[PDB]
Amino acid sequence: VRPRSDVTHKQLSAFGEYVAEILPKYVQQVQVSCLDELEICIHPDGVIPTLTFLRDHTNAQFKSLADLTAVDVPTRQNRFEIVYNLLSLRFNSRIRVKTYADELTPIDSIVSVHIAANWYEREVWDMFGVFFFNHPDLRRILTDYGFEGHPFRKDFPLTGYVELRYDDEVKRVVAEPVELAQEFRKFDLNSPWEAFPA
């Protein structure tokens, strides 16, 4: 069983309250995991304001953006859950600010607050389809130039719909609808028995 120090779960908890108090217009929920990690949750409109306070506040300097990601809970009305993980080299602590964005309700861009996000925001658009206003140059980064569809969405087939082969007749690479020679065997793995109350 991992060793857990409650010093952190107390320090981080307090900070959470501090952030919440300072930014009550946007903070909806602020929780600390059992793993000693804080996760302020903000209304999408608070993207710019909450980050800026953390990047430039003496009692909470969160200078670098570790990551910007978007889990996709299809059930959730607001499908995407943009999560921004930040690090404070001054206070040696990380916080995560997570917002919610639906497919056609764009989030603001923080390239202003952290220029690290210039690329990750393009990554989130390419994979999940969330759009970021005021982004300097939003354009697909990881997917092919002509790719249609946002791949990491839970509703996108793994194999996808198009695959490439070289055709002599046309002497050029050519998409064709995917035809797989051994479909992905979809093993069902969930057991019908729960583990604990959680």
Binding site: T105, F131, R139, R140, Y145, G146, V170, R172, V174, P177
Partner: protein, 114 residues
């Protein structure tokens, strides 16, 4: 209802943007067919542009339209700032794939699940 506007307050304003993109593509088709040495006819290509711009003619919601041009603009950028080579462009024409008939009798004769 009660939705927030992405970039266009109403289908009207949005349509303005579509007009601009159409023009953009229309003016660009010829250049691509020459800078990519594509074996297509400018007229032919320009019809394709029309095809696509109408494939999505049914959309009534302003927000959906706005994203559609954002995406459309991005595609143009990849074809005028050329990062998309012929293989990419010609794919639009679906040149190699064999067309599938939509006639019931046709499908019956060929596929288990139509």
């Amino acid at each position: 209802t009660s939705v927030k506007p992405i970039f266009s307050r109403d289908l009207n304003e949005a349509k303005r943007r579509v007009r601009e993109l159409y023009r953009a593509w229309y003016r660009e088709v010829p250049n691509t067919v020459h800078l990519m040495q594509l074996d297509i006819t400018v007229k032919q290509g320009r019809d394709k542009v029309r095809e696509m711009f109408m494939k999505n003619a049914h959309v009534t919601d302003p927000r959906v339209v706005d994203l559609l041009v954002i995406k459309g603009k991005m595609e143009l950028q990849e074809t005028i700032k050329v990062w998309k080579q012929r293989t990419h462009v010609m794919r639009f024409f679906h040149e190699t794939e064999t067309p599938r008939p939509k006639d019931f009798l046709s499908k019956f004769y060929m596929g288990h699940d139509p």
